Amino acid sequence: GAITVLHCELTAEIGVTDSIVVSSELVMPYTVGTWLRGVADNWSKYSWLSVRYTYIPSCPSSTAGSIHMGFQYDMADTVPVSVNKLSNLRGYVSGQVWSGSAGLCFINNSRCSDTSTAISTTLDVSELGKKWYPYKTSADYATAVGVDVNIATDLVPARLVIALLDGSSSTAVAAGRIYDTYTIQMIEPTASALNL
Amino acid sequence: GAITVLHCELTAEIGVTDSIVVSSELVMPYTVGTWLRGVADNWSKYSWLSVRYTYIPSCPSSTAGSIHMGFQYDMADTVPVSVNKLSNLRGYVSGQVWSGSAGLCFINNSRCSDTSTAISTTLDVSELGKKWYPYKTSADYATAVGVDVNIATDLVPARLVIALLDGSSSTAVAAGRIYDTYTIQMIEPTASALNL
Amino acid sequence: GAITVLHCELTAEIGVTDSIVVSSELVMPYTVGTWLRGVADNWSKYSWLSVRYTYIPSCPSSTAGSIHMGFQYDMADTVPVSVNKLSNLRGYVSGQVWSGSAGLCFINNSRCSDTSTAISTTLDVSELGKKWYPYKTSADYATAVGVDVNIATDLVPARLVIALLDGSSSTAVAAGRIYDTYTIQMIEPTASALNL
Amino acid sequence: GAITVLHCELTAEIGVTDSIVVSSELVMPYTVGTWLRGVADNWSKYSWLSVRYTYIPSCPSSTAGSIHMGFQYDMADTVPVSVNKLSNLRGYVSGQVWSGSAGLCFINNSRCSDTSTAISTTLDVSELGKKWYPYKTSADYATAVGVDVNIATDLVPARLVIALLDGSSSTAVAAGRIYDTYTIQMIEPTASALNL
Amino acid sequence: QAGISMAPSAQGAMVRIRNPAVSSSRGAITVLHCELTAEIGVTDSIVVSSELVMPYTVGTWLRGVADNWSKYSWLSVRYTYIPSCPSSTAGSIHMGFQYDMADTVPVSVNKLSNLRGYVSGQVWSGSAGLCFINNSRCSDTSTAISTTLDVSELGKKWYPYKTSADYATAVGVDVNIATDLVPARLVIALLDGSSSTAVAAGRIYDTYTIQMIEPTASALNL
Amino acid sequence: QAGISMAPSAQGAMVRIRNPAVSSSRGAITVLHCELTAEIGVTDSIVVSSELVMPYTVGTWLRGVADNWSKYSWLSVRYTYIPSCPSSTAGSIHMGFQYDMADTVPVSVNKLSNLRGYVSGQVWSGSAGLCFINNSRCSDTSTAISTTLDVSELGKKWYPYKTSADYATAVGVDVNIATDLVPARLVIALLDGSSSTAVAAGRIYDTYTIQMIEPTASALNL
Ligand SMILES: [Ca+2]
Ligand SMILES: [Ca+2]
Ligand SMILES: [Ca+2]
Ligand SMILES: [Ca+2]
Ligand SMILES: [Ca+2]
Ligand SMILES: [Ca+2]
Ligand SMILES: [Ca+2]
Ligand SMILES: [Ca+2]
Numbered sequence A, B, C, D: 001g002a003i004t005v006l007h008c009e010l011t012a013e014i015g016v017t018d019s020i021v022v023s024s025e026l027v028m029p030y031t032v033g034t035w036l037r038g039v040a041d042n043w044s045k046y047s048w049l050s051v052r053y054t055y056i057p058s059c060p061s062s063t064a065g066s067i068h069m070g071f072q073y074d075m076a077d078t079v080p081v082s083v084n085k086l087s088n089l090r091g092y093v094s095g096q097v098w099s100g101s102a103g104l105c106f107i108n109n110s111r112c113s114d115t116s117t118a119i120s121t122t123l124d125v126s127e128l129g130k131k132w133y134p135y136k137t138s139a140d141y142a143t144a145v146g147v148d149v150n151i152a153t154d155l156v157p158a159r160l161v162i163a164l165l166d167g168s169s170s171t172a173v174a175a176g177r178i179y180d181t182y183t184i185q186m187i188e189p190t191a192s193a194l195n196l
Numbered sequence E, F: 001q002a003g004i005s006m007a008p009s010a011q012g013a014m015v016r017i018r019n020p021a022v023s024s025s026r027g028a029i030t031v032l033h034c035e036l037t038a039e040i041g042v043t044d045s046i047v048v049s050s051e052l053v054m055p056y057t058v059g060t061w062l063r064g065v066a067d068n069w070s071k072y073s074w075l076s077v078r079y080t081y082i083p084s085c086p087s088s089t090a091g092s093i094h095m096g097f098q099y100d101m102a103d104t105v106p107v108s109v110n111k112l113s114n115l116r117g118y119v120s121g122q123v124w125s126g127s128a129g130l131c132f133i134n135n136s137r138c139s140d141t142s143t144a145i146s147t148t149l150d151v152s153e154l155g156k157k158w159y160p161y162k163t164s165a166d167y168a169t170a171v172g173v174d175v176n177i178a179t180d181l182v183p184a185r186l187v188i189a190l191l192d193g194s195s196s197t198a199v200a201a202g203r204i205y206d207t208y209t210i211q212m213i214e215p216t217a218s219a220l221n222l
Helices: A034-040 A102-107 A137-145 B032-040 B099-108 B140-148 C033-039 C101-106 C138-147 D034-040 D099-106 D138-147 E059-065 E109-113 E125-133 E163-173 F060-066 F108-113 F127-134 F164-173
Strands: A005-016 A021-026 A043-057 A066-072 A090-096 A119-122 A160-167 A175-188 B004-017 B021-026 B042-059 B067-074 B090-096 B120-122 B158-167 B172-189 C005-014 C021-026 C043-057 C066-072 C090-096 C119-120 C157-164 C173-190 D003-016 D019-025 D043-055 D066-072 D090-096 D119-122 D158-164 D173-188 E004-007 E021-024 E029-042 E047-052 E069-083 E093-098 E116-122 E146-148 E185-191 E199-215 F010-013 F021-024 F029-042 F047-052 F069-083 F092-098 F115-123 F147-148 F185-191 F199-215
Touching: A005 A034, A005 A043, A005 A160, A034 A175, A034 B021, A034 E021, A043 A066, A043 A102, A066 A119, A090 A119, A090 E199, A102 A119, A102 A175, A102 F108, A175 B090, A175 E109, B004 B032, B004 B042, B004 B067, B004 B158, B004 D003, B021 C033, B042 B067, B042 B099, B042 C090, B042 F029, B067 B120, B067 B172, B067 F199, B099 B172, B099 C090, B120 C033, B140 E163, B172 E116, C005 C033, C005 C043, C005 C066, C005 C157, C005 D034, C033 C173, C043 C066, C043 C101, C066 C119, C066 C173, C090 D173, C101 C173, D003 D034, D003 D043, D003 D158, D003 E109, D003 F185, D034 D173, D043 D066, D066 D119, D090 D119, D090 F010, D099 D119, D099 D173, D099 E093, D099 E116, E004 F127, E029 E047, E029 E069, E029 E093, E029 E185, E093 E146, E093 F164, E109 E116, E109 E185, E109 F164, E116 E146, F010 F069, F010 F127, F021 F147, F029 F060, F029 F069, F029 F092, F060 F199, F069 F092, F092 F108, F108 F115, F108 F185, F115 F147, F127 F199
Parallel strands: none
Antiparallel strands: A005 A175, A021 A160, A043 A119, A043 A175, A066 A090, A066 A160, B004 B172, B021 B158, B042 B120, B042 B172, B067 B090, B067 B158, C005 C173, C021 C157, C043 C119, C043 C173, C066 C090, C066 C157, D003 D173, D019 D158, D043 D119, D043 D173, D066 D090, D066 D158, E004 F010, E021 E029, E029 E199, E047 E185, E069 E146, E069 E199, E093 E116, E093 E185, F021 F029, F029 F199, F047 F185, F069 F147, F069 F199, F092 F115, F092 F185
16 A cells, blocks of 8 residues: 655755845645655555755866755744754755755765765654655645744645855855755545645 | 444435435544444543445335445545545545445354445544544534634544435435444543543 | 254244334244244254345235334343334344345355345344353243233243235235244153143 | 453542441442443443452541442342441442552552552452343333332342441531443443433 | 561652663763652542653753753663552552544543553552662562553654744644654642542652754753 | 650551452361450540450451351450550550359459550550451560450350340340350550540551351351
8 A cells, every 4th residue: 555656856955145044834735746746645644764865966076155954843833043953953964055966866876985975864664754745735834834833744744944155145045955855655545636 | 551442323414305415424433423422531641543434225116316434634635526536536436325234244244255246435543644543523623614624633633524416315314324343442531521 | 861853944924014013933953943933842842043034026016014022031121113113123134025136145045145135134142141052932922921021021932023014905915924944952851742 | 242341430429428438339330330321231231251440539537437338249139227237238448538549550550569558359250140231221220120129130230239327417528439440341332312 | 477468557659769860871961850840639529640851840940951852762661660658558650641632631540440550559668669760779569559651652752842832833723733742741640538628648749761862052942 | 775765756566458368178167366345545534444355346348258157266356555646655455354244243443454465555555465356477566465265265166146136135134144145355445544535546456267067058056
């Protein structure tokens, strides 16, 4: 009954400016990437076997700026407001917007050489609070969270906080992209139209 | 520690009309049936070890109509509106409203040889959200869900949806009944009067 | 010492109407059937080694109606008034009034392969109150019970309750018959004329 | 088919005065305690695997008075009228209303150290006159017993006689509570509403 | 000697709490400690009280330490009653656990006696449970009024660190939202006393072992 | 430690009587048992009471068993007092035996103190005698309030089983007729109390070993 998918897809496009810009992505099928969003909808519940976010650069070596990533686990906790608080989170990694190429091996599965320079981080699936979560659409999530954020705890495993700053322009400059590489188990099918 | 009970009881009475009529039942002690609702209330939490719904006919071989059953696990998902949509659910099982007698052996657990025609489905007890669920009353559940449906995922493991159509009359004709056969582990006793 | 008999005989004739009609039969030699009543009277006490009631139809596949059976053990308990209440008893077994032929093999004890549809239930001969029960006549039992019902627990091991409903006519239609297949051990001979 | 429950619950609240006050409790589910009373009703018959009554104090060390307990087995026998006769009964134990704390280990199952000071006594389940008794409500019992007490023999295994005296007040002073710790086997389910 | 007991005039128990034990394994950090958790007083009528078993409310120290981690798991939680009155004091204490916050709080020792971890005892006894708090070698704990959480049967393993404030708000929307945030609550009942006015009976200490994971600046933790 | 004593607030003694031991040798059948024999209460003035030491009156069980035999002989008879009040209770108990039913019952602890088997003690003590009843291994019975019959010095060995009724009639003709039927009587005195009204003090248990001979249908035994 468990049907397993392994895949790496574009999860977010990154631009860097001269000011801190904190953003976050829920670590659930619907938000992880559009491809998964579409396939996972045909199933009622899932379990993350492995989730790794890897940043791959697209800018010139002359591009100033740094990216910082880390995880949060209680949606009710406040999202880091400074890059300082961010550095306290689990899974913190911080790189420079033009580096990270060695991480490419995580995206195309070829054998990785030295990945100490890859700006990549992974989710601690075993310390998550439950193994089988329900597939949620961001819309429905939003509504729930609107009543009380604590309703999110039963619905989503974690949140990926990203921070970009130290750039040189007041206007966004294309830095790179964050790709997500996951192994997921999907169970109990459903027509997607009913999945909220 | 745990106190295990295996039992069978009437869970619902069924009637066929000439138009689709989808209905559902929460898979929790309180609603599985009257007897279980009663004994289960003396414990605080429980865990399903086995749950099986078996439809048994009571109409003549000439009764037009068909029955359909399946499970859903995110109380927030839309309930099916058609046989096609329903056929996708886990544990889907369809059949003539006058068929299904072979499932009798599941009820008074005897030797089941002829079970290829039994209109009986089983809950995937291991892929459920968690192990120990709290005993809830229809009333309390109802209120919670009235705030936000997602508050339900923390309380009920699944719901059985039932659809009946293909009947001959626009007014309901008696078809059969759905019986539930479960094995449940209960823990943390409480005076029933306190249990909501 | 003991004299063992295994036999099968007609125990009751059945008819369906459009309203519930719960009836019951004491599980004692005198009432199980005419033949046993006759031979059993030549012994003072007896012990059931096996008792099985099997319903066998005699109506067309188009006959509306359903049959229900179960056991009760405290003659003082109220007899069921509905299918729900009845479905809780031990050995509950329900089915279409025109179904049940697979149970024939229990009657003339042959090889039973297709028994998943047999509307047949069995007495839990080992959890009975005691082993040796005295042979009683309907008359004598009746009087005793007329003083106080509890006087019955010392004399009869159980009673089979039968409920028929879902019929189409308000006037009884012939459905089928209930046959009893038992194995009994008898001891302490007596001239039958003395046996009350 | 045998479903087993193990539990310890409050069975009686004790007050002491300056005069002998003899009381008794039938050793049957219905009277043993309200929790059991409610769960055991869903089953037709039971068997006691173990029954132990333990008194736990709640008064000051300065509380004068003694409790005496013992068993009776033929409901027709006269209830002890003096504490003397009481001391002849099987299972006799007599303690002082402020002592008995060591018996707490019987109530919460923690490992018992030295229980020679616990005012506790147990039922000789093997010398009982039958193993499977019918669940009876005190109301129905009363009626039966009203016709002739001997009808009780077939219905209940034993009776716990309690005597409290030697207190210092003409008016009851709260001494302690008697908790019952049992292991019971329940068989042949029934809707509780029918159980008398 | 077997069967004999002597009621003392008063029991004495010298509580001496040792330094908290903290240590980080790989991923998980573990704390072990004891804290005074509640004060107790008796009356002639029954009075039921409850305490949620979550870091924030279990103890004043724990509250501030646990806040630096995102989630936690209880390895062990024990409540022990230590008396502070003479054997002449009337009254009894009763404890037990409830696991569905929506359930009604017990209103009698009869209902109470059915709960998981139930324990009763004279308001003037229980010094035997001292070894649990002091950390000494336990002798005969037969007469201790102490109970413990059945951690293995709890709803889930990892719970989020919550502040009473945020919790209180959640629960205000619907009490069932609590199920997802807190594992259980200790219920405490006291009665059998002699004054209509409360009489100080004793106090309750909590001894626990908790596992904490996934760090976060405290300020962000709600 | 030598010379030091600590008065407790109250003494506790958990009485648990075991199954009677009966066995037939050749001619003689022997019973061994314990029965609660009397209830005790104190007052500020002296109150003397007596109990005949014969099967019929020694115990309610013995009474009915011994009746199936024509004669008997006491192998051992012991009376032990077990308290049921606190050490704050005023009062003392005194026991002794008399052997000529015609003699006057003592009217003072002074006369009483001269009797065979005399024992005194605070109405709130005596738990040390528990081992005699419970059948446990006796430790320091130094402070037990328990006394025993001097069976070897009794008037004769075999006495006839008598019912209180028939005895009472005999004695009514002349008390000296008792000498031939009963071996002795226990005298009990209580005083030193504080209420003019009796205050429950404790109770007395009797532990005996008796030999019974020459069977008879019970109905004939008077
Ligand atoms: Ca959850
Ligand atoms: Ca969904
Ligand atoms: Ca509940
Ligand atoms: Ca007869
Ligand atoms: Ca009987
Ligand atoms: Ca009954
Ligand atoms: Ca938090
Ligand atoms: Ca005589």
